Amino acid sequence: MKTTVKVAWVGLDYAGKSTIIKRITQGVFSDDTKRTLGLNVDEFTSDNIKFVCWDIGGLQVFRDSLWDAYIAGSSGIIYVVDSAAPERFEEARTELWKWVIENSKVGDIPILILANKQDLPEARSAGEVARALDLHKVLKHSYAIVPCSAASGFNLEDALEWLRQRITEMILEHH
Ligand SMILES: Nc1nc2c(ncn2[C@@H]2O[C@H](COP(=O)(O)OP(=O)(O)OP(=O)(O)O)[C@@H](O)[C@H]2O)c(=O)[nH]1
Numbered sequence: 001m002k003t004t005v006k007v008a009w010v011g012l013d014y015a016g017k018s019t020i021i022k023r024i025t026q027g028v029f030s031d032d033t034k035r036t037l038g039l040n041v042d043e044f045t046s047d048n049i050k051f052v053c054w055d056i057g058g059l060q061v062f063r064d065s066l067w068d069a070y071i072a073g074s075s076g077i078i079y080v081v082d083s084a085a086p087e088r089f090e091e092a093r094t095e096l097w098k099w100v101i102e103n104s105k106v107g108d109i110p111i112l113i114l115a116n117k118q119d120l121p122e123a124r125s126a127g128e129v130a131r132a133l134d135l136h137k138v139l140k141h142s143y144a145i146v147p148c149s150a151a152s153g154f155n156l157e158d159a160l161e162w163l164r165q166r167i168t169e170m171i172l173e174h175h
């Protein structure tokens, strides 16, 4: 029997949340993924864990209507950033801090930041994305940052393994 955990996939519109989930669940890269106009629900299993992926649209309208509930009901949060869109790093930092770092509804749950689109020539490194999001100023929450690509699959297995390990560690430490 597997334990069900709900994971909220958040991040700005165009960050690559839906494309990463498609690469993991279908094994294929879609370079023409369409904007999510609400919620996509998908599943993937990794060992004793059934991951229920809540892929929420990142457009402003969906942050204000849907993000609060799915973030508050999740067991883990994945915040995806387009590393090749530095014109939106300040906006991505603002939303990460409002909806995750300083959101009182987020307890001591796993927080994984994915610095996505590493395959693109203008992609900033994981270190550069961490500094742009002020991750080095996060004082009370644990977090991980992983550079990845839905196009090549780079680090997607390792990122999912990190989440499975953190969720399993919480279960084992409590027992
Ligand atoms: N080259 C490249 N393109 C990517 C990658 N991830 C996503 N894309 C592309 O980036 C665009 C936006 O990806 P989406 O998956 O729709 O982004 P999203 O975060 O789900 O956006 P919303 O649905 O608006 O929340 C699409 O054209 C994707 O094909 C990646 O790692 N590399």
Ligand SMILES: [Mg+2]
Pocket (backbone or CB within 6 Å): 017, 018, 019, 034, 035, 036, 055, 056, 057, 058
């Ligand atoms: Mg989407």
